[PDB]
């Protein structure tokens, strides 16, 4: 039981190891999602623009045939491929409205986990 009428929000959660693209309606209810690991890029190449393009194309094709036409992009986390995903969901029928970087930064919060040697 979902209902996405005309416009929605795309969420990209990237990191140094993987990228997850998830499209949702105005109430943040996900209708489709994809990732490099889902596409089958289990390697160091999970953080590749090609993998991001493949995942974004799959997600956009899966979600376009549901009434989704316009989307607003939110991006969290670093990593190559966010631009590729944005371009792919822009060119796969879905029209982008704005690009918003919601990457969370701390105002000196909790302690980071040590340092690798």
């Amino acid at each position: 039981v979902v209902r996405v009428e005309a416009v929605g929000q795309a969420h990209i959660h990237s990191s140094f190891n993987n990228i997850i693209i998830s499209l949702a309606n105005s109430e943040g209810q996900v209708i489709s999602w994809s990732s490099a690991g889902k596409m089958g890029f289990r390697s160091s190449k999970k953080n590749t623009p090609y993998a991001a393009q493949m995942a974004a194309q799959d997600c956009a094709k899966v979600a376009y045939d549901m009434g989704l036409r316009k989307v607003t992009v939110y991006v969290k986390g670093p990593g190559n491929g966010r631009e590729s995903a944005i371009r792919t969901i822009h060119g796969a029928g879905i029209e982008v409205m704005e690009i918003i970087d919601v990457t969370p930064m701390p105002h000196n919060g909790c302690r980071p986990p040590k340092k690798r040697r």
């Binding site: 670093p78 631009e83 371009r87 690009i99 918003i100 919601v102 980071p112 986990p113 040590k114 340092k115």
Partner: protein
Amino acid sequence: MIVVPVIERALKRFKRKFEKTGAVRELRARQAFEKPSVAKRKKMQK
């Protein structure tokens, strides 16, 4: 919270805004812990 209202020009603008903000630099900094002595000595050497 970098906002780039709007595709190649928009993507270039978003990348430039992100680079100007320096979110990736602070993310790389926050990936690990640095001692206050280490930070102070790095600042003194720089």
